[PDB]
From a paper:
Islet amyloid polypeptide (IAPP, or amylin) is a 37-residue peptide hormone that is cosecreted with insulin and one of the most amyloid-prone sequences known. Amyloid fibrils have a similar cross-β architecture, but fibrils formed by a single protein sequence can have diverse structures, varying with time, self-assembly conditions, and sequence modifications.
Fibrils were imaged after 2 weeks, at which point fibril formation was at a steady state, as judged by analyzing aliquots with ThT. Following helical reconstruction, multiple distinct IAPP fibril polymorphs were resolved, revealing further detail on the apparent morphological differences between the samples. The majority of fibrils formed in the control (69%) and doxazosin-treated (72%) samples were classified into three related fibril structures (named LL, LLU, and LLUU, respectively), which have a shared structural core consisting of a pair of protofilaments related by a 21-screw symmetry. Each protofilament is formed from a single stack of L-shaped IAPP subunits, with straight β-strand segments encompassing 13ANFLVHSSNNF23 and 25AILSSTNVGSNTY37-NH2, hinging on a turn at Gly24. By contrast, the control and doxazosin-treated samples consisted of L-fold (62% or 72%, respectively), U-fold (34% or 28%), and S-fold (4% or 0%) subunits.
Residue numbers in the entry:
A (entry chain W), B (entry chain S), C (entry chain O), D (entry chain K), E (entry chain G), F (entry chain C), ...: 14 to 32
G (entry chain U), H (entry chain Q), I (entry chain M), J (entry chain I), K (entry chain E), L (entry chain A), ...: 13 to 37
Amino acid sequence: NFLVHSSNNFGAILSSTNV
Amino acid sequence: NFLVHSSNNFGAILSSTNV
Amino acid sequence: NFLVHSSNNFGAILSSTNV
Amino acid sequence: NFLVHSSNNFGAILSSTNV
Amino acid sequence: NFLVHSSNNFGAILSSTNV
Amino acid sequence: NFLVHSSNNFGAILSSTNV
Amino acid sequence: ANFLVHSSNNFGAILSSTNVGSNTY
Amino acid sequence: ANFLVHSSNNFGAILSSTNVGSNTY
Amino acid sequence: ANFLVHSSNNFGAILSSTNVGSNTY
Amino acid sequence: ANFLVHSSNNFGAILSSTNVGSNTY
Amino acid sequence: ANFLVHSSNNFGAILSSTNVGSNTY
Amino acid sequence: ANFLVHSSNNFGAILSSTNVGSNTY
Amino acid sequence: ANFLVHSSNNFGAILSSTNVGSNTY
Amino acid sequence: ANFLVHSSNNFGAILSSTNVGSNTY
Amino acid sequence: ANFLVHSSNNFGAILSSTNVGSNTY
Amino acid sequence: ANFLVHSSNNFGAILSSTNVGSNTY
Amino acid sequence: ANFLVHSSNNFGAILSSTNVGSNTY
Amino acid sequence: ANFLVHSSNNFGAILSSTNVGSNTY
Amino acid sequence: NFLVHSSNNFGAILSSTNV
Amino acid sequence: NFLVHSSNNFGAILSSTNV
Amino acid sequence: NFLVHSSNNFGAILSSTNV
Amino acid sequence: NFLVHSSNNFGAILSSTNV
Amino acid sequence: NFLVHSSNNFGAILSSTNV
Amino acid sequence: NFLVHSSNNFGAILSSTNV
């Protein structure tokens, strides 16, 4: 599973999966 | 499992998985 | 498992896995 | 398991695993 | 297990595992 | 097990394992 | 919870050229 | 919890050229 | 918990050229 | 817990060229 | 717990060239 | 616990060239 | 007699204020 | 007689204020 | 007689203030 | 007679203030 | 008679203040 | 008669203050 | 006598008499 | 006598008499 | 007599008499 | 007599008489 | 007599008489 | 008599008489 959970985000959130 | 949990993020959060 | 848990992050958090 | 736990981070946290 | 636990971090914390 | 525990870190903490 | 926040995020190339002067008196 | 925060994040190349002068009196 | 924070994060190349002068009097 | 923090983080190459002068009087 | 902190972190190459002068009087 | 801290951390190459002078009077 | 002349004469007070910037990205 | 002349004459007070910057990225 | 001349004459007070910078990244 | 001349004459007080910097990365 | 001349004459007080720096990385 | 001359004449008080530095990394 | 004679004047010519 | 004679003047010529 | 004679003046010529 | 004679003046010529 | 004779002046010529 | 004779002057020539 790939899950991103964010609360009160004022910044930058970068999530990446490369095969 | 790949999980990112963030609260009150004002900075930069970079998460990456490369194969 | 790959887990990143962040609270009150004002800095930079870099997490990477390379194969 | 690979786990990163951060609280009140104002600095730089770099975590990497390379094979 | 690979675990990083940080509280009130204003400096730089670098953790790496290379094979 | 590989564990890093830091509290009130203003300096530099470098931990590395190389095989 | 009270939040007063000024936030700026940038992700693109920025080029700026400024010239001030070349006045003859 | 009270937060007053000024936050700036940059991720792109930035080029700046400034010239001030070349005035003849 | 009261937080007053000024935070700056940079991740891109920055080039700056500044020239001030070349005035004839 | 009261926090007053000025934080700066840099991760990119920075080039700066400054010239001040070349004035004729 | 009261914290007043000025923190600077650098991780990139920095080149700085400064010239001041070359004035004729 | 009261903390007043000025902290500087550096990890990158730094080159600095400074020239001051070459003035004719 | 051939004359090609650019001539500028000034006799009055001159005030100049210039602001360039204050851009948020 | 051939004359090619650039001439500038000044006799008055001159005040110049220049601000370049204050950009947030 | 051939004359090529660049001439500058100044007789008044000159005040110049320049600020370049104050950029947050 | 061939004359190529660059001439500068100054007779007034000159004040110059320059600030370059104060950038946070 | 061939003359190539660069001439500078100064007769007034000159004050110059230069500040370069105060950058946080 | 061929003359190539660079001439500088000064007759007034000159004050110069230069500061370069105060950078935190 | 007060006499000002000018030919091909591109500059500034200031003549004054004050008693 | 007060006489000012100028030819091909590109500069500044200031003549003054004060009593 | 007060006489000023100028030819091809590109500079500054200041003549003054004060009593 | 007060006489000023100038030819091809690119510099500064200051002549003054004060009593 | 007070006489100033100048030719091809690129410098500064200061002549003064004070009583 | 007070006489100043200058030719091809690139320097500074200061002549003064004070009583």
